[PDB]
A paper describes a structure:
The final step of exocytosis in yeast involves the assembly of two t-SNAREs, Sso1/2 and Sec9, with the v-SNARE, Snc1/2, on secretory vesicles. The exocytic vesicle-docking site in yeast is marked by the octameric exocyst complex, which belongs to the CATCHR family of multi-subunit tethering proteins. Our previous work showed that one of the exocyst components, Sec3, promotes SNARE assembly by interacting with the t-SNARE Sso2. Like syntaxin-1 and other related t-SNAREs, Sso2 consists of four helices, with the first three (Habc) forming an inhibitory domain and the last (H3) serving as the SNARE motif that interacts with the other two SNAREs during membrane fusion.
Author numbering:
A (entry chain A): 76 to 250
B (entry chain B): 4 to 8, 33 to 149, 197 to 226
Write the structure that this text describes.
């Protein structure tokens, strides 16, 4: 199982670099790692579906990482990171989970999805399964974190998140 | 946590599934009645009838907690019996998904009632109600996680 073993190696490296030691300059406890996924980011088209003619040099390998504040399981953060040659990771951006307002499945690209937080971000997983697995983790985390609320969901099977039509209408943040 | 991985035997197993499906129906009705009593409280009810409505709500909440405990045990047991049979595992997992959706139904129903209580209010007994609601939602979250744990 390549995807399972890659997950085990990635998770151990992520926790080791970035979610186990006290803060470098502040001494705060580290965040608690929750999950992650590998993503492809197009540097020229980061907020929309990239065209097929997009140069291959535009494609960047990044990771999305979810974590919780050390003294508040209700404060979730999303981190984007890149992988260093030694096996460690460098976080380049952090969002608070309260920024997630819209999550859309790309109907045309089987690995594509769009998160609306600070703005719209287009990303691709490496496989359709990895999109299903990560978005499930993300929406499940949100519904649990914000006690019965859910961002706007576009083109998803609601049953993936244990919702149906009218449970989604009661829970969606747009009210 | 790696997300990337009755004498006849089948008649006996399906007796478990039939029993689970009956309690899932009981669970769904109890949640349905909890939602209804929330809507009753959200109408302006005389102080006498209001407390009879609160004790009935308390009774239904306790029934749900005990049904949840029984549904967890019975579903995880059906998952064990299916650890070596494709048909049994499909049956048990189907029951697990039904359970999780109802737990999600309950969690959303309590969330709507929590937010609608404040937007209708603005004594200290209202604070004890919020602590009871937060207790239940912590349990539903804890129960949600127990049901996602693998059975081995």
């Amino acid at each position: 199982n390549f995807l399972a073993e890659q997950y085990e190696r990635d998770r151990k490296a992520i926790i080791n670099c970035c979610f186990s030691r006290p803060d470098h300059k502040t001494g705060e406890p580290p965040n608690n790692y929750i999950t992650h996924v590998r993503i492809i980011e197009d540097s020229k088209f980061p907020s929309s579906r990239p065209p097929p003619d997009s140069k291959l040099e535009n494609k960047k390998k990044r990771l999305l990482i979810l974590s919780a504040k050390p003294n508040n399981a209700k404060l979730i953060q999303i981190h984007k990171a890149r992988e260093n040659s030694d096996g460690s990771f460098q976080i380049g951006r952090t969002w608070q989970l309260t920024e997630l307002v819209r999550v859309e499945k790309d109907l045309e690209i089987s690995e594509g999805f769009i998160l609306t937080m600070s703005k719209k971000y287009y990303w691709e997983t490496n496989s359709a399964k990895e999109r299903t697995v990560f978005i499930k983790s993300l929406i499940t985390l949100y519904i649990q974190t914000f006690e019965g609320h859910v961002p706007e969901l576009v083109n998803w099977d609601l049953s993936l998140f244990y919702l149906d039509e009218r449970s989604y209408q009661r829970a969606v943040i747009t009210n | 946590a790696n997300p990337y991985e009755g004498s006849d035997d089948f008649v006996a197993f399906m007796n478990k599934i039939n029993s689970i499906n009956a309690n899932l129906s009981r669970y769904e009705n109890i949640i349905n009645q909890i939602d209804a009593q929330h809507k009753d409280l959200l109408t302006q009810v005389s102080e006498e009838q209001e407390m009879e409505l609160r004790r009935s709500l308390d009774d239904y909440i306790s029934q749900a907690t005990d049904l949840q405990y029984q549904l967890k045990a019975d579903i995880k047991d059906a998952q064990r019996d299916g650890l070596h049979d494709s048909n049994k595992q499909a049956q048990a997992e189907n029951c697990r998904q039904k359970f999780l959706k109802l737990i999600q139904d309950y969690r959303i129903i309590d969330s709507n009632y929590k937010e609608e209580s404040k937007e209708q209010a603005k004594v200290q007994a209202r604070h004890q109600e919020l602590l009871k609601l937060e207790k239940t939602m912590a349990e539903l979250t804890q129960l949600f996680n127990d049901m996602e744990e693998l059975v081995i």
